[PDB]
Amino acid sequence: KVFGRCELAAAMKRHGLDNYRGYSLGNWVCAAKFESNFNTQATNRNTDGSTDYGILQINSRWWCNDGRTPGSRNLCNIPCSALLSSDITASVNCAKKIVSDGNGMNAWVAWRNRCKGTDVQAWIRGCRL
């Protein structure tokens, strides 16, 4: 599924992401835009044998089990495939653990490269939240 910008913002606010750990909704919508372009099916294979899954591109090496990642840990206790659902619940709950893992949103390289320090409020423009 491909979320519209405001449709995703609403869904994220609904799952408690706005201001979570001090990160405004704009930050999350922006991270999702550059990590997967709002595509819940997005997957990126890495050269280290791991794969990033879903709307927030969660990595299989530590957060989910895809059964094909060497020395992988399943800290979110879920199959990576559940992160490819049209329902973002799984991704959000897992993301909530990642953002609290000692690096803030720096855990998402796309957020760091394209959202950090910018006027992230713009990503919520036109949204009736």
Method: X-ray
- Do 15 and 55 form a contact (C-beta atoms < 8 A)? no
How far apart CA 1 and CA 97 sit, in angstroms, is 24
**Candidates 7, 35, 48, 66; catalytic one:** 35
Structure tokens at 110: 């796309």
Instruction: Determine whether 48 is exposed, middle or buried from the number of CB atoms within 10 Å of its CB (0-12, 13-18, 19+).
Output: exposed
Resolution of the deposited coordinates, in angstroms?
Answer: 2.0
Can 7 be counted among the known catalytic residues?
no
Backbone angles phi, psi at 2, to 5 degrees: -115, 110
Q: How many domains does the chain have?
A: 1
Can 35 be counted among the known catalytic residues?
yes
Task: Provide the CATH number for the domain around residue 29.
Answer: 1.10.530.10
- Do 43 and 51 form a contact (C-beta atoms < 8 A)? yes
Backbone angles phi, psi at 59, to 5 degrees: -80, 130
Range of the domain at 9: 1-129
